Amino acid sequence: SNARIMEEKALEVYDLIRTIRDPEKPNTLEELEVVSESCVEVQEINEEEYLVIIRFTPTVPHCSLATLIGLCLRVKLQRCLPFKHKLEIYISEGTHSTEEDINKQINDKERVAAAMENPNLREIVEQCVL
């Protein structure tokens, strides 16, 4: 059965993501209920290629947290998953950055440099400043 094999893969995925540490607190994603077993789904694209879908909820709805958790899920799974896979990840809510936090971001040199190196963003800017 496709369906039961997909449930086996979802448990494998979950066993790898549960012990990822939160970007902010000294606890695991599982401990803080950012992820749980039911938040994973696996689908077949074609033999030898699976799509993994992970829903998660950061401890508070802040953009930088959501970004970082997304990065950790990809890094951990890319390194540790023993089958070829596409990954899609979804948060269940909008997020925000406080006045203080967004001003930090738009002035932080590392953050500015990374957006500048994004070819999609750099082209939008190119076209605004002409």
CB of 108 to Zn ion, least distance (A): 13
List Cβ neighbours of 22 (8 Å cut-off, separation of 6 or more): 28, 29, 32, 34, 59, 69
**Binding flag, residue 103, a copy of itself (CB under 8 A):** yes
**Binding flag, residue 115, a copy of itself (CB under 8 A):** yes
**Binding flag, residue 112, a copy of itself (CB under 8 A):** yes
Q: Which stretch binds Zn ion (CB under 5 A): 9-17, 20-28, 48-56, 95-103?
A: 95-103
Q: After which residues is the chain broken (C to N over 2.5 A)?
A: none
What spatial distance separates the first Cα and last Cα of the chain, rounded to whole Å? 58
For 35, half-sphere exposure in the C-beta direction (CA atoms, 13 angstrom radius) is: 29
Q: Which stretch binds Zn ion (CB under 5 A): 5-13, 31-39, 63-71, 72-80?
A: 63-71
Residues near Zn ion (CB under 5 A): 63, 97
- Binding site for Zn(2+): what residues are annotated? 62, 96, 123, 126
